[PDB]
Structure 1
Amino acid sequence: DRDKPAQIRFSNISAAKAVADAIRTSLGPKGMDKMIQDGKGDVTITNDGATILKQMQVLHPAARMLVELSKAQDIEAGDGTTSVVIIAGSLLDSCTKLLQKGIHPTIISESFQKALEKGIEILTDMSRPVELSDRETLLNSATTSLNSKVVSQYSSLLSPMSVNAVMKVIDPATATSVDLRDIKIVKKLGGTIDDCELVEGLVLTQKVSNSGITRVEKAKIGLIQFCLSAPKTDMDNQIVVSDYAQMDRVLREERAYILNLVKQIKKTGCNVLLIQKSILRDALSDLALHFLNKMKIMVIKDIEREDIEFICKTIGTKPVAHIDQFTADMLGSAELAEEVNLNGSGKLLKITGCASPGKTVTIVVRGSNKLVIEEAERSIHDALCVIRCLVKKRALIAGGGAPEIELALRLTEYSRTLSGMESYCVRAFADAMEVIPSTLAENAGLNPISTVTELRNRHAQGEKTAGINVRKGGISNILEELVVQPLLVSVSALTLATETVRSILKID
């Protein structure tokens, strides 16, 4: 019977739940890093559940879901991905209870996304909206969220760079979701984090020109989705391999064709030519390109066809497999096309001004070294995420697991008010909240069962007059030390586990 699935489910339950605890050890920065041996047989030390999910993992199906548990929250808010694992085992406990209570996993499921809709309101009831139209508010808030987080040093510097690059991809007063889509994060090997800079036309890998103009203004950006190499009738060459004599006349053929298509390039014309890799091509004849930049066209060669897809959408240089697809049509018009070799190492074609869809925003990442480059990458991304957290979900809420302490007691009664056989469900549903700050209270160190009992009254009283406050890690107003989070990291965490549980509940 579905008992065997329940067993399976229980076994999946058995797998997934102990896994969620391993991150509960890493819950919060007060939560502890976890040393991990890998196939290398070497230690791996992270407080990051998302990697601990990915890095060494069991492919058990319940465990398979839990990476996407965070990986959604990874891609949802970019943040709060520990919590979404820390929310998992809390119901997974309670769900087995109902299963142990004999509650039908549908009814179990059925009771939840139902009651989840409830909780988020009361959760949102706790919340304080900030101004998404105001750059500085968010520049204060996500910063305060960055201040609520570990990465500051560059994030401080990079909050304006984030929020501005965001504010530049903020058209709306709502500030929409602020897709990181329109953002191109580029790194340049030289420079410093001070030399990380927001650029309003795409900073492009390198540049490639033989006789091609070094920097062309008003650049018509070509793209080559067509093969510049003459057709391959033997190896790469329009010749066939037998003797010296017959091939040289069709060596003449390889000549003109590669030039003509190249001639045709500049004849419909471009100031710049996007060129993907020649492996991203069948083949591209350089003697054509030798003549193509000899036609004095600024060009880049060997760029990601996927970054091309980014380039196509952001600066409006559309995919071109044809001379005809060159007019100005699929060609983005780039006001200043130049590569900057400057500030130490690296060279990157930097579009300065363009004819571009949306507001095209690329940020250079320069750093004292590669590692210094590497470190600011989260700094923005962190900021960029808590931004795309809060701009996407307007209402801001404080962190520290308090809203869970706040929401549980209420949903327990809401369960009771809801009543019904599903009350016990929604009760157990409500009963998964404190678990996160519970382990978190240990993660800062405390007795949550002692501490959370009291905030729960505090959160019975002011609903937040206090909360586990990361430095304190204990009862005090978290709005006072400003440990803050957009509702997105919270809300985005809710549906996943529940649904994924709601999934595994129906799942045999």
Structure 2
Amino acid sequence: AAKDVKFGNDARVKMLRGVNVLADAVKVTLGPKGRNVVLDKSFGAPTITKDGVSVAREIELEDKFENMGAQMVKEVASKANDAAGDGTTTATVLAQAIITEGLKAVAAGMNPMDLKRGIDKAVTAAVEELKALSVPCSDSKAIAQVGTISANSDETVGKLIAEAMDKVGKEGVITVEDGTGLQDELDVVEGMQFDRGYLSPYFINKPETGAVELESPFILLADKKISNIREMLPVLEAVAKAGKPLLIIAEDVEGEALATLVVNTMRGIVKVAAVKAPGFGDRRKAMLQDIATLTGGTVISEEIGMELEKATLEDLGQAKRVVINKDTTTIIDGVGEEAAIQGRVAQIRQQIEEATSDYDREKLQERVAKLAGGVAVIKVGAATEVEMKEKKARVEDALHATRAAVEEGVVAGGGVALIRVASKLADLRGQNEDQNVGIKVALRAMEAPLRQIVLNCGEEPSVVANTVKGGDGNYGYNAATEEYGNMIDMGILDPTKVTRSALQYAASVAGLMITTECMVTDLPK
């Protein structure tokens, strides 16, 4: 249809208004003293949250240009949430600060490209500075501490995650379930994990989590693109007879198959999920064979000559539980015999031994690692079901934070790590005046998180930020107790990975938005 275009400073001010609205709405809820925010609900009373993810999710503006600006910031913030699992509102606050200052400078008659270059130089120097400031978190004591502080200062969950990490490994697979008894339960069973996402969001049976849970499902092993709906009618009839859910791996699934599966899921006669095949090519087939060994299934491939129509329930694999993430998959206790698993592990081990290519050897090594280590199961334990759900959520977010800290490290939280990095990089200079201005914009924008936290606490942000900058090391402000002190000693810690990802993505979106003129959008109607 007809499209209204807007280029020049008016496009920038529209984008600024949109990001200002979104950033205010989501930054009000930053820190431990985060002020509540109320989201309208269609039916019933409104929900009340301090989680910035929900606030961002429920933001879109009436004006088209402001809405697109807000949507850009929202998308990059959600990307940051996906990368590290936390620091969404920190990313949005950093983005708002950098964009506000950068667009102000651009309106001040400066070159957008040089500003973006200066900001990029500043942020990469800041990233390597964070890596310098990073403190390793390999010891189980710090693992327990970070798990504790992530889960609202609960030592039991920190202990549980520490034991699970020791049991499986540093880079192992950890999952959380519900336990019958009041006592917490831990057990390690042969499982699976590969990074692939669901084909359509509609497969999510629990939207509040964004995943699926399929108790004792059949898993279908396919190496051929899903072309026609006629290929999986016999298996659909079989699973309808079984009255037990189903999951599908495939090289790809075409749009008509997506529509058919969505229709079947809303119908509810069969609950089926589908996910992209892992790996690529010959190794995709190798790990499909690994999954066949796990679940007792069989790979169905056109090259072999097998067809999906002639598939029996025995040919299908099974597990006792499967969970799909937005961009990951996990299978727990494939029914396949463990002796066959050991044989396959040995076979891939000799494949590693004969391997000469370094990267192929890396794929084989990670394959044997994921095929031997398996998965961990941490069944939460308490009395009532409401506390089952809340403690399960606490375990989930603590696990995310702890693994993020393990991957890269852990730095002084409360926004003090960025303050220290900015103070360290005070002497950085670019190739001209505009790059210098961009670098200074980045440096003064990295102080946004601490200032916003202090403002939420109600104290004067300028005074607290100046005092924190005056100090050195990890000396910082405690929002909870409103007392200064070494942040590590008082246990306020966040992963290096989350802060790095939030900073990098905020810088990326700010650079992208600074150098934008044209705004093509639908005519308001």
1:495 maps to: 504
2:425 maps to: 411
Match of 2:128 among 121, 136, 150: 121
* Percent of pairs with identical residues: 19
C-alpha deviation, 1:402, in angstroms = 1.2
Q: Which residues in structure 2 correspond to 1:242-253 (within 5 Å)?
A: none
1:399 maps to: 413
C-alpha deviation, 1:53, in angstroms = 0.4
Residue type of the partner of 2:497?
Answer: L
Residue type of the partner of 2:108?
Answer: K
Q: Which has the higher contact order (CA 8 A, sep 6+)?
A: 2
Residue type of the partner of 1:404?
Answer: L
Partner Cα distance (2:107, 2:38) in 1: 34
* Residue 51 of structure 1 pairs with residue 45 of structure 2: no
Match of 1:93 among 91, 95, 100: 100
* Contact 1:192–1:369 under 8 Å retained in 2: no
Match of 1:427 among 440, 443, 448: 440
Q: Which residues in structure 2 correspond to 1:442-481 (within 5 Å)?
A: 442-458=455-471, 462-464=472-474, 466-481=475-490
Q: Which residues in structure 2 correspond to 1:15-94 (within 5 Å)?
A: 15-40=18-43, 42-58=45-61, 60-94=67-101
What TM-score do you get using the length of structure 2 for normalisation? 0.65
**1:102-122 C-alpha deviation (Å, 9 max, x unpaired):** 222222222212211111223
2:152 maps to: 151
Matched residue SS, 2:407? coil
Match of 1:201 among 162, 185, 190: 190
Q: CA RMSD in A?
A: 4.4
Match of 1:316 among 276, 288, 294: 294
Partner Cα distance (1:281, 1:31) in 2: 39
**1:375-402 C-alpha deviation (Å, 9 max, x unpaired):** 1232222222112211221x32010111
Matched residue SS, 1:128? coil
Matched residue SS, 1:75? helix
Partner Cα distance (2:463, 2:262) in 1: 65
Matched residue SS, 1:476? strand
* Contact 1:224–1:320 under 8 Å retained in 2: yes
Partner Cα distance (1:199, 1:326) in 2: 30
Partner Cα distance (2:108, 2:503) in 1: 24
Partner Cα distance (2:406, 2:505) in 1: 20
Change (3 A) 1:3 1:491: same
2:389 maps to: 374
Residue type of the partner of 1:201?
Answer: E
**1:49-103 C-alpha deviation (Å, 9 max, x unpaired):** 1111013444811211233333222211112222112212111221122112222
Partner Cα distance (1:222, 1:435) in 2: 48
Partner Cα distance (1:25, 1:381) in 2: 24
2:161 maps to: 162
Residue type of the partner of 1:407?
Answer: V
* Contact 1:77–1:492 under 8 Å retained in 2: yes
* Residue 482 of structure 1 pairs with residue 481 of structure 2: no
Residue type of the partner of 1:143?
Answer: A
Change (3 A) 1:454 1:199: same
Change (3 A) 1:331 1:472: same
* Contact 1:27–1:83 under 8 Å retained in 2: yes
C-alpha deviation, 1:26, in angstroms = 0.9
Change (3 A) 1:96 1:207: closer
Matched residue SS, 1:480? coil
In structure 1, the gaps of 5 or more residues are: 132-136, 209-220, 227-231, 238-256, 263-271, 284-300, 339-347
* Contact 1:455–1:467 under 8 Å retained in 2: yes
Partner Cα distance (1:38, 1:422) in 2: 46
**1:209-233 C-alpha deviation (Å, 9 max, x unpaired):** xxxxxxxxxxxx984879xxxxx99
C-alpha deviation, 1:148, in angstroms = 3.4
Change (3 A) 1:168 1:13: farther
* Contact 2:146–2:402 under 8 Å retained in 1: no
2:402 maps to: 387
What TM-score do you get using the length of structure 1 for normalisation? 0.67
| Aligned residue pairs, count | 405
Matched residue SS, 1:467? strand
Partner Cα distance (2:90, 2:216) in 1: 43
* Contact 2:123–2:504 under 8 Å retained in 1: yes
Partner Cα distance (1:309, 1:18) in 2: 40
* Contact 1:196–1:366 under 8 Å retained in 2: yes
* Contact 1:33–1:45 under 8 Å retained in 2: yes
Matched residue SS, 1:4? coil
C-alpha deviation, 1:431, in angstroms = 0.7
* Contact 1:320–1:330 under 8 Å retained in 2: no
Matched residue SS, 1:28? coil
Matched residue SS, 1:363? strand
Task: Answer with 1 or 2: which has the greater Rg.
Answer: 1
**1:427-447 C-alpha deviation (Å, 9 max, x unpaired):** 111111222111211223321
Change (3 A) 1:72 1:168: farther
Match of 2:246 among 276, 295, 312: 276
* Residue 363 of structure 1 pairs with residue 386 of structure 2: no
Matched residue SS, 2:428? helix
Partner Cα distance (1:4, 1:223) in 2: 51
C-alpha deviation, 1:420, in angstroms = 3.8
C-alpha deviation, 1:358, in angstroms = 5.1
C-alpha deviation, 1:494, in angstroms = 0.8
Partner Cα distance (1:198, 1:469) in 2: 38
**1:313-344 C-alpha deviation (Å, 9 max, x unpaired):** 77733664559999999968x9xx89xxxxxx
2:142 maps to: 141
Change (3 A) 1:351 1:3: closer
In structure 2, the gaps of 5 or more residues are: 193-212, 224-228, 249-259, 279-286, 301-305, 322-330, 342-369, 518-525
C-alpha deviation, 1:8, in angstroms = 1.3
Partner Cα distance (1:497, 1:47) in 2: 21
Change (3 A) 1:445 1:451: same
